Design a protein around this ligand. Structure first.
Ligand code: FES
Length: 106
């Protein structure tokens, strides 16, 4: 399924993500180093921080307690639509989802 990563400079990268793969895994697997997951994807850091486009704010599973807690560690501005990419799991229903990658992760 399609996922679009928009950089701080507006650069857009479209990736084909398989079912069950997190947006973090797909990002690092394709050279999108802006959101490398330091903790490895277990919601133990905040370097995979991204802004989920309002167009898909609800069409995505709500953040859990671990994520909620860790979002406070993000270095980039914490916004209402701030999420941890390693917590967003791809499914056909998310096809076309767009997430903005904060330039800073530290
Ligand atoms: S990679 Fe560590 S919280 Fe997402």
């Amino acid at each position: 399924s399609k996922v679009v990563y928009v950089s701080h400079d507006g650069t857009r990268r479209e990736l084909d993500v398989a079912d069950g793969v997190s947006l973090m895994q797909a990002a690092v697997s394709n050279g999108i180093y802006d959101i490398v997951g330091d903790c490895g994807g277990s919601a133990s850091c905040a370097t995979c921080h991204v802004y989920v486009n309002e167009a898909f704010t609800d069409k995505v599973p709500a953040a859990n307690e671990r994520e909620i807690g860790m979002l406070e560690s993000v270095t980039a501005e914490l916004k209402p639509n701030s999420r941890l990419s390693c917590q967003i799991i791809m499914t056909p229903e998310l096809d076309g989802i767009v997430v903005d990658v904060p330039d800073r992760q530290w």
